[PDB]
Amino acid sequence: CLAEGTRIFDPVTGTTHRIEDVVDGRKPIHVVAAAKDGTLHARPVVSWFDQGTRDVIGLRIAGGAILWATPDHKVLTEYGWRAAGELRKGDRVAVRDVETGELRYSVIREVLPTRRARTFDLEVEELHTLVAEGVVVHN
């Protein structure tokens, strides 16, 4: 699950939304999804999930961005899909350039301790993945 505050980019409208607003408002946004072959595509959100309050850890990425997700949330990394909780400083995660939309890999600068927060999940059509805080994660 993803934490309240997690930002999601809609490649169709070009609008960035906070996930708690997308779920609470059942907003029909599109997200940038990643296929199995790595390619990125725009896909619609067809289901919204309020997962309640849970512990979320933070993955501070080179550049300054930070993803807050449950330790079991899957992230696309240089070694494939892996639970956020298994990732450590130095591991590289897949990130979408906010300027060019290009996919690159950046190192995790720091892994932060857990904190309490409302958490969410979304169902992305067909590919079941999305870009959160610029990072490619499972929906």
- Domain borders along the chain are 1-139
Grouping H, G, I as helix, E, B as strand and the rest as coil, residue 14 is coil
The DSSP code for 89 is T
β strands within 2-102, DSSP E: 2-3, 7-9, 16-18, 30-34, 40-61, 66-69, 74-77, 80-83, 92-96
Q: What gap in Å lies between CA 139 and CA 124, rounded to an integer?
A: 6
Handedness of CA 86, 84, 49, 53 (dihedral sign): positive
Q: What gap in Å lies between CA 101 and CA 94, rounded to an integer?
A: 12
Q: Which amino acid is at 17?
A: H
Q: What gap in Å lies between CA 1 and CA 61, rounded to an integer?
A: 19
**Which residues does residue 118 pair with via DSSP β-bridges, in sequence order?**
53
Other CB atoms closer than 10 Å to residue 60's CB: what's the count?
15
With breaks defined as C to next N over 2.5 Å, after which residues does the chain break? none
Query: Which value in Å is the resolution of this experimental model?
Result: 1.6
- Experimental method, per PDB record: X-ray
- Give me the numbers of helices (H) and strands (E) for the chain, helices first please: 1, 12
Per CATH, which fold does 1-139 belong to?
A: Endonuclease - Pi-scei; Chain A, domain 1 (2.170.16)
Q: What gap in Å lies between CA 64 and CA 49, rounded to an integer?
A: 28
